[PDB]
Amino acid sequence: HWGYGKHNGPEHWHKDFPIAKGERQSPVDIDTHTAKYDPSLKPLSVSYDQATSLRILNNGHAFNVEFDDSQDKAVLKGGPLDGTYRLIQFHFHWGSLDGQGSEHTVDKKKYAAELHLVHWNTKYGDFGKAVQQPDGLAVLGIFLKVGSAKPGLQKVVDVLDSIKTKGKSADFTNFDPRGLLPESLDYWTYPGSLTTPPLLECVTWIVLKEPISVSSEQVLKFRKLNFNGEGEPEELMVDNWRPAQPLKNRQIKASFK
Ligand SMILES: NS(=O)(=O)/N=C1\NCc2ccccc2N1
Ligand SMILES: [Zn+2]
């Protein structure tokens, strides 16, 4: 099955998922000089005050923090979006070394990690129906650089020891995702895809310009997770990122001058 190794990684995915070579694949390099300010773009509305986290899961590719998405509890609106998108989960991609790990790049620069907050368009009723639609999903992407610790990340870091291997999960209620955001909501946006199989072309990407800083100790704990299941040979969960894909017939828009 698919993964991030030499024998099952991003260069192999197209054999099972031919859309891997499609017209709106993600991630992409964000060329900051070619991206154009769009004054028609609205401010992003990130409404996470009533978010209800459920659980954290090691799925063998990353770890996901899952949320209750049965009502409009944590939603994303505005910006390039029409209507309302409900938060279903977040996860990260990260590297084996601080100089790599992000999926999007900015003028070819790679960050140490990238946070993805995944949301689905409520007009389609459920996530499964949303991923059959060209405007089904909105993913808020946030870069991580290594510097001072991010206090709102520490609760995530301190539970990772309990989900070391694939298939393990733990209760993760009462987590506030507002603690993962930077100060500014300035962003770039473009139409793209899921960055993991099945690579579906359903996503409005919203990538924040301002990174968050996390400490070396925080990102080191990410790197102690395992891709494998319990009792199997240990393979550290590192370098779980897809590289930038061809931009093709797309334009990246900026919310800021
Ligand atoms: N890295 S990503 O673009 O959020 N990719 C994702 N997100 C959410 C998801 C749910 C189910 C199956 C695959 C994926 N892939
Ligand atoms: Zn992701």
C-alpha to C-alpha distance for 162 and 171, rounded to whole angstroms: 10
3-state per-residue secondary structure call for 97-132: CCCCCCCCEECCECCCEEEEEEEEEHHHCCHHHHCC
User: Do the Cβ atoms of 208 and 186 come closer than 8 Å?
Assistant: yes
How many CB atoms are located within 10 Å of the residue 13 CB? 20
219 Cβ below 6 A of ligand 1: no
Cis peptide before 27 (omega within 30 of 0): yes
Residue spans per domain, the chain: 1-257
C-alpha to C-alpha distance for 30 and 204, rounded to whole angstroms: 15
Residue in the block written with tokens 């990684």: 9
Q: Reported resolution in A?
A: 1.0
Closest Cα to residue 203, out of 76, 108, 113?
76
Residues with Cβ within 8 Å of residue 43, at least 6 apart in sequence: 78, 79, 185, 255
186: left (phi over 0), alpha (psi -120 to 50) or beta: beta
The single-letter code of the amino acid at 68 is D
How many CB atoms are located within 10 Å of the residue 49 CB? 9
User: Do the Cβ atoms of 112 and 239 come closer than 8 Å?
Assistant: no
Ligand 1, from 103, 118, 190: best to mutate by most atoms within 8 Å of Cβ? 118
User: Do the Cβ atoms of 194 and 25 come closer than 8 Å?
Assistant: no
Residue 215 is encoded by which pair of tokens? 């400490």
195 appears as a binding residue in the annotation: yes
Residue 111 is encoded by which pair of tokens? 């960050």
C-alpha to C-alpha distance for 190 and 35, rounded to whole angstroms: 10
Closest Cα to residue 181, out of 219, 216, 143, 146?
143
The verdict on whether 61 is a catalytic residue reads yes
245 Cβ below 6 A of ligand 1: no
Ligand 1, from 91, 142, 196, 245: best to mutate by most atoms within 8 Å of Cβ? 196
For 61, counting Cβ atoms within 10 Å of its Cβ (0-12 exposed, 13-18 middle, 19+ buried), the class is middle
195 Cβ below 6 A of ligand 1: yes
Q: Are strands 113-121 and 85-94 parallel, antiparallel or unpaired?
A: antiparallel
